[PDB]
């Protein structure tokens, strides 16, 4: 199980 989503918002 994993709670942090892998962020991909480079902006």
């Amino acid at each position, epitope marked *: 199980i994993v709670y942090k989503p892998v962020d*991909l*918002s480079k902006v």
Partner: antibody
Amino acid sequence: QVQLVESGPEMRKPGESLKISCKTSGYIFSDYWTAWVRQLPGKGLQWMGIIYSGDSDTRYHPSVQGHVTMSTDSSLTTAYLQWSSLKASDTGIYYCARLDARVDAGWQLDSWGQGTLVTVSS
Amino acid sequence: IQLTQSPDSLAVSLGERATINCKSSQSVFYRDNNKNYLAWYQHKSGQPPKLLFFWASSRESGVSDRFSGSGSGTDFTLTIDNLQAEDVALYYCQHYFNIPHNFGQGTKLEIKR
């Protein structure tokens, strides 16, 4: 006109090199990623990976990682998908699509390429 | 994280409610954002995949009023009311919680006339 346009169908032999293109026009290229999606025969979609132009940040599916390579040329507004040495098993339809890179926005594929049937055979 | 859709195939009559469900092996609902990292797709013959929904329930621009995105946590649902003939397609749920952004196996929707 949000439009991704891939190259036409390609034919190769096993062992040979190939790079297909994904020409992105009608929007700001730095605002998005460009994903790659293999169409499985009959039914299915394997998400291969993604690539961002300004940073050159690659994230792959652990099965396809190492076997294929991604790259982007920011001047042409194009994304690519290379094969160093093709197998017969690589044959299939390969889609590309944009993923939204803005702050607190969803990473979903809203606009897609037409698709390219890469075929590897002796 | 893997996705198992249910059913694989489905025949539904013109004007009936079509129900396609999607099940996560883990969980694509981040508690801080109050948002489900999950989308839905339609895939007709001779065309690329068209996006239906994202954030589970939020609808794409131009997508029909008859289509509905719903469910939370592990279990999600696509609901096509008043089924029209053009809705003949393969349907795919997809998560983007973590990498890889896996699609589901595929749900084939056939029309009964």
